[PDB]
């Protein structure tokens, strides 16, 4: 039973522009069906009409993949340093960028005229998540088994902007992935770092 699927820091405000940070790719275990993901994004918390996000996944069988969303796919390896970033130029346009830094690869995606859902630009976040997997049309959805990972996934040089100005993570709310009434992450904040250890 997954009670909380998000772990990390969530900032609440207005006119959020850019959210970015660099995260290390951890080693994962627990089998091919076990997984986890690390991403940065805007909205999706108090703003439930849309979510601009980009990040990467790790599976218990040693594999990884990258994605963006308002598509999946750069090659990712354990230990790589990934710089993630999303920008919302308006409530219906923006961009998502992922840069491996270690391999020198980089992917980017520009969005515009997004009608299927607008942003509010009121939530900014750095998250570690036990994501869902759906199918059978759109009915059956389930949380993937949560993979154990190490070392801790750290979002360093975290950066949040609103109205062009910088916003610290000092007043961010903190959440933890919780399964079977047990914290499975220990995410904490400090300076410009959001550090999440698997538990």
Swiss-Prot record:
It catalyses: Hydrolysis of proteins with broad specificity, cleaving 24-Phe-|-Phe-25, but not 15-Leu-|-Tyr-16 and 25-Phe-|-Tyr-26 in the B chain of insulin. It comes from Scytalidium lignicola (Hyphomycete). The chain holds residues 55 to 260 of 260 of the full protein. It comes from the Eukaryota. The active site is at 129 (proton acceptor). Monomer. This is Scytalidopepsin B. Belongs to the peptidase G1 family. The record marks 53 as: Transition state stabilizer.
């Amino acid at each position: 039973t997954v009670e909380s699927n998000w772990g990390g820091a969530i900032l609440i405000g207005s006119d959020f522009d850019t959210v970015s940070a660099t995260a290390n790719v951890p080693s994962a275990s627990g089998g091919s069906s076990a997984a986890g993901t690390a991403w940065v994004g805007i909205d999706g918390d108090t703003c439930q009409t849309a979510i601009l996000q980009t990040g990467f996944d790790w599976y218990g069988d040693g594999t990884y993949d990258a994605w963006y969303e308002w598509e999946v796919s750069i090659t990712i390896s354990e230990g790589d340093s990934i710089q993630m970033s999303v920008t919302a130029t308006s409530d219906t346009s923006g961009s998502a960028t992922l840069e491996n830094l270690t391999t020198g690869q980089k992917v980017s995606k520009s969005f515009s005229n997004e009608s299927s859902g607008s942003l509010c630009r009121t939530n900014a976040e750095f998250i570690i998540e036990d994501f869902e997997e759906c199918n059978s049309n759109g009915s059956d959805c389930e949380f993937v088994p949560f993979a154990s990972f190490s070392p801790a996934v750290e979002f360093t040089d975290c950066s949040v902007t609103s109205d062009g100005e910088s916003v610290s993570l000092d007043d961010a709310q903190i959440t933890q992935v919780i399964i079977n009434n047990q914290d499975v992450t220990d995410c904490s904040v400090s300076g410009t770092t959001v550090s999440c250890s698997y538990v």
